[PDB]
Symmetry: D2
């Protein structure tokens, strides 16, 4: 039985309302989770607001101890996190294993950096003036998270936000409440001061909107669909609260003619399809140079044929799991259908059963396919063929999304001209598009959102600069002129 965590106490919703949650894998019953109203949200927010000053003006080193204790506790709960991440989220073994490991590195990173967030000492154009800039935490920070990689993304947000001295109200993804409960578990066993961190499970339209519009929330960091992020930004405007938005993207994977082709294909398969393409930074549009295009397509398709779809609980070598739910399969079917009816050649896949969806691969697409124009969050992928670098770029940019991208090539000048030219918040040469480290500035441009997360960048999102001076000389003043 899952509960909210508010002011250091595990409890019901005040509305008493409850909701059943079942696995995307077999549909079997998982847990009963709260479904919370504005009362619950309001309360969590308050608890955080009152914990805020105590939490922020204690020494950084101390918050860091807390975070290391959290690392401790996490290292003990790894098993349960892998388990829930598979059962609730439909992650494969190797996927959730990765998610857990990464999460560890994340928490650690926050602890590591807390003591080192630095203001600046400044030169003055005034004489006898001492002029510095301090870093201060924003306040209560709303944390709203996706369902695909819910442990790692949640923890990046939460750990880093806590480290530099903000408190946290955290409304997990609707489709992954158990994971969020487990995080709350972890935090509570770490023994953080009551109210410093709060879990509220519930509907976005209810909990989320209180979190986003409330007077006392200083900042919101969101990860989800671009519609939701957009309106969240609009509502955040009312209270002048600042936001960090990772809105997802359709990432170009450019492959040039000088590549080892086999490798390029394996890489593409891993990047475009891992976790069923349900990655925000998944490689959602494969752009390939004409000269290698036929061999590439052959080998890509070859390894896509090798992918094993199964119950992720079966064993460690299961490649692909379910989509998170029925809606996702609906939408993926739509994408495939649209693809065929527009004249696209289905090279493979397209079968679905329950929540599972075979990777579906298309060539012969134009820019008017929905799978070119939209974020396909799931395993349906285009392969576009381009005649030169100019064209590869032009395609890679033809999209509303700015999140990430990659290029495979051995030519340094091509690697760099392409990397410079592709409009993306992140770009990787000779690697997957979803490359992520804990301390690096993760984020998009264009429709993919605003802000960066990880390390000092997360700290930048949740803190502000305070210019402070001490003026050491007496001075004469211009008014009244009579003096």
């Amino acid at each position: 039985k899952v509960a909210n965590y508010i002011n250091g106490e595990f409890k019901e919703p005040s509305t008493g309302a409850f909701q059943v949650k079942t696995s995307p894998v077999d549909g079997s019953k998982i847990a009963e989770v709260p479904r919370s109203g504005r009362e619950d949200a309001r309360e969590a927010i308050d608890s955080a607001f009152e914990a805020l000053k105590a939490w922020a003006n204690i020494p950084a080193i101390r918050r860091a101890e807390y975070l290391y204790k959290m690392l401790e506790v996490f290292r003990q709960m790894k098993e349960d996190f892998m388990k829930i991440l598979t059962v609730e989220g439909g992650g494969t073994y190797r996927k959730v294993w990765g998610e857990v490991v990464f999460t560890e590195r994340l928490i650690q990173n926050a602890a590591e950096l807390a003591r080192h967030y630095q203001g600046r000492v400044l030169q003055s154009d005034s004489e006898s003036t001492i002029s510095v800039v301090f870093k201060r935490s924003k306040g209560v920070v709303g944390v709203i998270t996706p369902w695909n990689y819910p442990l790692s993304i949640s923890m990046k947000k939460i750990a880093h936000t806590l480290a530099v001295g903000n408190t946290v109200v955290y409304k997990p993804a609707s489709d992954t409440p158990v994971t969020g409960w487990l995080i709350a578990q972890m935090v509570a066993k770490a023994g953080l001061p009551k109210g410093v961190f709060n879990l509220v499970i519930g509907p976005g339209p209810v909990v989320g909107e209180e979190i986003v519009t409330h007077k006392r929330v200083a900042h919101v960091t969101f990860t989800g669909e671009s519609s939701t992020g957009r309106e969240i930004a609009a509502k955040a405007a009312g209270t002048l609260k600042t936001v960090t938005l990772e809105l997802g993207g359709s990432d170009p994977l450019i492959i040039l003619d000088d590549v080892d082709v086999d490798y390029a294909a394996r890489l593409a398969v891993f990047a475009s399809l891992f976790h069923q393409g349900q990655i925000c930074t998944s490689a959602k549009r494969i752009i390939v140079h004409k000269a290698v295009a036929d061999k590439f397509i052959e080998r890509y398709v070859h390894y896509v044929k090798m992918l094993r779809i199964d119950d992720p609980r079966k064993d460690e070598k299961v490649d692909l799991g379910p989509l998170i739910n029925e809606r996702q399969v609906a939408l993926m079917k739509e994408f495939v259908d649209d693809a065929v009816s527009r004249g696209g050649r289905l090279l493979i896949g397209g079968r679905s059963w329950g929540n599972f969806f075979e990777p579906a691969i298309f060539v012969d697409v134009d820019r008017n396919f929905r799978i070119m124009r939209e974020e396909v969050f799931g395993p349906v992928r285009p392969i576009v063929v381009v005649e030169n670098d100019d064209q590869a770029v032009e395609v890679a940019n033809d999209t509303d999304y700015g999140l990430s991208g990659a290029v495979l090539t051995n030519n340094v000048n091509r690697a760099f001209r392409i990397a410079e030219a592709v409009e993306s918040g992140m770009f990787h040469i000779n690697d997957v598009t979803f490359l992520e480290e804990s301390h690096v500035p993760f984020g998009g441009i264009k429709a993919s959102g605003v802000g960066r997360e990880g390390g000092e960048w997360s700290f930048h999102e949740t803190t502000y600069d305070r210019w402070v001076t001490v003026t050491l000389r007496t001075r004469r003043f211009p008014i009244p002129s009579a003096l």
Copy 2:
């Protein structure tokens, strides 16, 4: 004096053919005809900027620095015509506009100086055979919308820095200070900056400004003005997911303790609170004095306010205080004084108002419910509040929706620091005026005073983004398919 828009490097008329007659706040004499621009004007500016962008951001930092330096020496040759339009159109005193102009010079030069030194990072990778760096790139076309109180300095702070790192600019000045904006575009024109990199559109906020805020191809909006306007700009900015810098004004605490030179405390206070008729954003709008000095202080502060010389800012250089910007400001200060009286405040001096002129109105015996404790009082009405101890000083200081700046006078290091740490503001000054400002330092508030910081590299932080870039030098194995 023929005033126009500046678009794609051309001085030109609005499409509307509209004109509007701008009058001086001083005597009401006609100053000049200025455009009233429509959406079509705005869109011409924005498109011009989007097209100039790639050209502008891909040239090396150092060339944009050249342009800024040219702009700077051009400015130096325009200084006194700037001063003139400042005194006449904005109603500033000689000493005010002189200061503003000098600081504008320091600003422009600062943007130029920093342009080449905005840096990214080289990071440790957690993976072997991986190079990991972070590049700085400029956003795009940047909206610049400015106030009338310090239009030269504020607009130039925004413009020059935003330009320096490679953004182009569409700029709509305060409706009451078009001519200053025109003089700016004149400067940028004599500067030689490429066609479409800077564009001036003089028009109504509701029409021009909003196209600037809501457009597809505008990247960012930096804004200084009323908090109402700030909130709604933020709102419509969310449409295109476009970021903003927001300076919304403040109600700035000025805290005076026992141990100060009460005379010096008073002089300082008069300067900070009333300079430019208290039309500075960071003006010391809420005066907090400790009871042990409060009587002497109040006496002495009032004495120095009585000595302020209010005249036509044109007549000579010694004039202390000139007019409020327009009728509505006088009507507002009247609302403020009327409110303070009927709430039982004691009005020590001032309140006389003739035309657009207002004698500074000083009030004591106020409480937290007076409109002038609860609102930004942009003008020369000021509260004095007496407090029993430092904790009351801070409590009171913090009782406000505003976060902008604040100050404390004291010779005691522990009180200076504990108060400075305790006071919720994004800027703070120990033993100086609240409105202290430098070229390169992070200017901005918290709470309802807005979001972001400006001047120097902080301006740079607002109008650029970070782009993580990696090269991978080892081929690897991947987890899927696991049959490999």
Copy 3:
């Protein structure tokens, strides 16, 4: 108790088989049999570390961090052992060595924390189509030479940080504290650091330290000890152009003005000046007080000094002072005392000594010719000097060859800051002890107190170099041959 060198992951004897007996400063009892090592041994360490170097430096930084974190765990289980040996060998009281072990834990943690985070820079280029970045690289095999007063914490501050950014380490601990060194190697070896990456050679400075300082393969030397020794080391280092970090100790001013709580100032001065028998590098070795509080301060300071409890540091936890490290320290403190009395100096208490235990000796009525003004007094003999104004308080504070730290006690913000500025020292502390030090802050002196800074990222700057790397993406024409 039989102690060895640590070389290439293996504990071993000195080649020559030579040993010498380390005896306690308390009773002169035998503590341990330690090595007396020759060039062969030094070179064996240096070579072990040079061969380890590319391997250890090329791994991802996070892996080094793992090793430092492990080292943290081992040190945590070794806390007791280190404490014991710090008291027995170093003569530190329980409280002193407890503080040292806490700060050592924090230092190891600090290094681990910062390892992954030491950043290079991405630069703007003045050249078209040029990518320009700057990488950080580890210097090489780094010689680490440490003192006896705080050997655990000082050693580990140099060692841990140097190791974090990817240098390897050859380490010669103070002659008078071989065993804490041995214990350090025990810790490292239990952390399973790669063979060769850390090395411990125990032996005479003129032989081991010499070889370290002169050897072809040592990139850097970080040293803490006497200034004479410092100048020697610097000079030798020049031979192969290896860089140095030098902490040479200071004669530190602790300045007390008239507006302090004089009792507080007294307690703080007793702490600052005499803690660990003033055998701290950054101890307050010259007390400077304003005539207004001078007499009350001297009464009160001397009162608190009399209350100081001297005893065998192994007895209990409440012992205030232990013994000086060895006979010659006493010989020297006596020389100091005699030079003070003979110069017309007034001795307020102490000067007696028994075995290696020295009773704190306080002097007033001194002048700048006194040895205890002109030299570093490393031990519990302290001057108190009375000054008229802040001016001559500074004049006295700066009159010394040394640059390390300083402190001022006052509540006046203006005096605090003008004195803090005026004092020429690498560190300064307003209203706290002269020896205040944290893991991540730039600890170092100026003048004769040495060169460099240490702790955290500054330790990283000492043991790394910057490397500019460009990729030009354009092909250009060249000025020669012109005929083309």
Copy 4:
């Protein structure tokens, strides 16, 4: 129209000895000027001028020094022509070279001015409660500036401009073979109106003026560019005062050409980098390493461009490719190198003709690592080409040298490019460009025998300033002794 003299505490004056030496043109040997021969008295008066002016100078707001440097840039802009003329006549630079140098000095002075207000300290989290913990940048002091003759104007001005920007004052001893350039710098600074004592020019022999500078008590730091022997010794003597230094000691830089390059382009670039200013650049590409597959074509095409090099009087016109070496000693040296190479079995593919101070670039193949021109810095136009079988070997040769200064690789393979870039042991590296790339604001300097420290922009600033940790404690606490209380 004017005599050459020292600049000390605001005044141009003769040496207290009144001594002089006649300095003559490396081109025709004709008289250029009488210049001072300064003694210790002169150096000590300079150092004392600077020490005296120091607190006045460091204390003013950085913006004011920025003004000074800006004015100095204005003055330089009107002295461009004069400078170019001297760099050609006194230092034997060709027109295109000195044009280059003067332009770069402009960028240098302007860069120092741009940065002076922007050199920042830090604000740290404290592990202690109620503590304000910050780090201030303070300037070091009087700074010794000792420069070479090869690029005397731009090197001097990097050191001088940046050192002044952050609040040091300066005592400047130029290279003996380029005193008139130093004098002209003094002229610039003087007309710029820097406070007396803030800048000082002393022209004398190194073993006297230079030594007093490096050994003196009041000098804080010494930035030196020049020979490694000289460098090492300055480090040594500097150590006695504990005075920090910046040593640019020269280097023999690898230019590695791989098989995937445009060989003709590689050749053109290699000619430029190896031979510009007759190979008298510190970062000159002094050891050319080429992959066997393209080695033949490269060697042919390299020699063909080198044969196209036009050597002449640098005053005849702007198209002159190479002018003279600085002095007779230098020709002598290049002869020593050539001689050694030949009798070690080297094949002399071209050049070696030497008339007066002029030297036709001598190019060798069939070289082994024992050749003097592999093992020592060759400052002048004698160059090795060494063929290697693969990237590993190329890196092995590139690294086999006592020097670390800079390096370059030509290739289009991003992996080979990077693996080599990171493999080569040097302070600087450039992919697909000449070894001697230098910008005003980037960290210029070597490792290994090539010296210590970095220069230009904030890096210069790090060299000539120190950090000062400063703290305010806002609470009182209890202390562990006496434990009785």
